[PDB]
Amino acid sequence: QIITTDNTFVSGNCDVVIGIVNNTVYDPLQLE
Amino acid sequence: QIITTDNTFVSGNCDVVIGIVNNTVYDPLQLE
Ligand SMILES: *[C@@H]1O[C@H](CO)[C@@H](O[C@@H]2O[C@H](CO)[C@@H](O)[C@H](O)[C@@H]2O)[C@H](O)[C@H]1NC(C)=O
Ligand SMILES: *[C@@H]1O[C@H](CO)[C@@H](O[C@@H]2O[C@H](CO)[C@@H](O)[C@H](O)[C@@H]2O)[C@H](O)[C@H]1NC(C)=O
Structure with missing residues (x-):
């Protein structure tokens, strides 16, 4: 999906999760 | 509710589920 x-x-600050990856998530709110 | x-x-295509029923769903975003 x-x-x-x-x-x-x-929930986080992108400096504490080991193995996190860079990607873009989508929101159904900005478009509308 | x-x-x-x-x-x-x-998730689907309205053509594979056996027993689907036509109805209208609601979304709280179109009004706003
Ligand atoms: C994911 O994307 C971040 C920015 O969108 C990256 O942060 C950068 O990190 C570099 C050093 O790695 C800095 O020089 C830069 O100023 C910025 O802070 C992040 O690194 C990146 N991580 C991965 C795994 O792609
Ligand atoms: C649910 O509503 C669909 C359209 O809103 C119906 O599709 C129609 O199907 C007929 C044939 O039965 C086509 O002629 C028409 O062009 C349209 O595609 C669908 O049948 C309907 N289903 C039920 C169970 O009411």
Whole structure:
């Protein structure tokens, strides 16, 4: 599935998770 | 409860599920 803000819950600062990867998540709110 | 896009998740093509029923779902984003 396309990784949207409904599929995922966000909590962190992108410096503590070992193995995190760079990608763009999608939001259904900005478009509307 | 009123069938909204958060109560349900969408995945399919309306042609493979046996017993599907025509109805309208609701989304809280189009109004806003
Ligand atoms: C994911 O993307 C980040 C920015 O969108 C990257 O941060 C950068 O990190 C470099 C050094 O790695 C800095 O020079 C730069 O200023 C910025 O902070 C991040 O590195 C990147 N990580 C991966 C794994 O792609
Ligand atoms: C649910 O609603 C669909 C359209 O909103 C219906 O599709 C139609 O199917 C007929 C043939 O039955 C076509 O002639 C028409 O062009 C349209 O594609 C669908 O049938 C309907 N299903 C039920 C169970 O009511």
